[PDB]
């Protein structure tokens, strides 16, 4: 009973990833989601960018081919639920 | 007719204020957009009263019916959060507001 | 703590409406950008001071202190039906007995 | 009053870089609109707007040799008539 939910990678590309989610219903529906993506090894910080809360998709570009990444989608506050994190290799 | 645009101006802010209690710091979509819509409509209808009716009369009517409505829409939607000395303090604040506007 | 940013939001709204009178129909850039900022801050300061103070309580205090600060700023350095400052002190009296 | 002093700085057969004295610190407007068209009138005119803080604007996509009439309007006309000039590329 938390949000968001069902973080999946729709389209893939050696230099870009298209992801989505099924957040929830109208009573949850927030104003902005912040999404973080970085390398799986962990020898660097983590990139971040926000997106309005009426959209459920997000396009990430400028990725390196062959490397495994970790993608996480957050909420404005930790009250809506624990964030969802996934992995994907380009 | 023009003494009704104020009645729509107060109520629109009444809803926008209680919806602000649901906005969760403007972090929740739908209550965040709701207060903006209601405040925009109240401005536009007040923009039609500031021609026929004056200032203090149209404002004291707002402050009177508004404080009597958004306070009543505070128990029906949750009950209470905190209470302190007197409700009569609110009554004499309104009495203090009324003796500088009308008088 | 609910009173500092309630009164600070009353200043932002007062400055917002007085500056709306200075600028024209949002045409003069510097004053119009100013008015936009203080009503955006007031909307965010009132929303944050509403979770503690009941809805009807913060209504009168703002309306009172506002016109108190409006009429205080009016006679302050702008222009000058004044029965007396008895009405200002009457707003002060009620704001006190709802306060801490 | 505003705008004031409309003149063309740089001039290329197919472009005109115009400028103006918008005003002084606090009396800036929010936007100006620029109207450049043929000095005759065989066709309508072209028009664009520029933010209030900017004091220059480039006009591209012109025909060489034709004389144009460039006019800059304030947001309203309650602070001065719009200044209009002429130039031949
Ligand atoms: C907090 C508060 N109390 C009384 C009146 C108003 C208010 N906020 C406003 C915003 C726009 C117009 C009127 C009000």
Author numbering:
A (entry chain C): 3 to 92
B (entry chain A): 2 to 104
C (entry chain B): 2 to 81, 84 to 103
D (entry chain D): 4 to 92
List sentences from the manuscript:
Representatives of the ‘Gdx’ (guanidinium export) subtype export a bacterial metabolite, guanidinium ion (Gdm+), in exchange for two protons.
We were able to obtain diffracting crystals in the presence of five structurally diverse compounds transported by EmrE: monovalent planar aromatic harmane (3.8 Å), divalent planar aromatic methyl viologen (3.1 Å), quaternary phosphoniums tetraphenylphosphonium (TPP+; 3.4 Å) and methyltriphenylphosphonium (MeTPP+; 3.2 Å), and quaternary ammonium benzyltrimethylammonium (3.9 Å). For all substrate-bound structures, the maps show positive densities between the substrate-binding E14 residues, including a four-lobed density for TPP+, a three-lobed density for MeTPP+, and oblong densities for the harmane and the methyl viologen structures. However, the positioning of each of these substrates centered close to the midpoint between the E14 carboxylate groups, similar to TPP+, implies that in the major component of the population, both glutamates bear a negative charge. Like a pair of calipers, the E14EmrE sidechains can move farther apart to accommodate large substrates such as quaternary ammoniums, or closer together for flat, aromatic substrates or substrates with small headgroups, like harmane and methyl viologen or singly substituted guanidinyl compounds. Although all the substrates in the present EmrE3 structures were contained within the aqueous pocket, we similarly observe rotameric rearrangements of the TM2 sidechains in different structures, including Y40EmrE and F44EmrE (equivalent to Gdx-Clo’s M39Clo and F43Clo) in the harmane and methyl viologen structures.
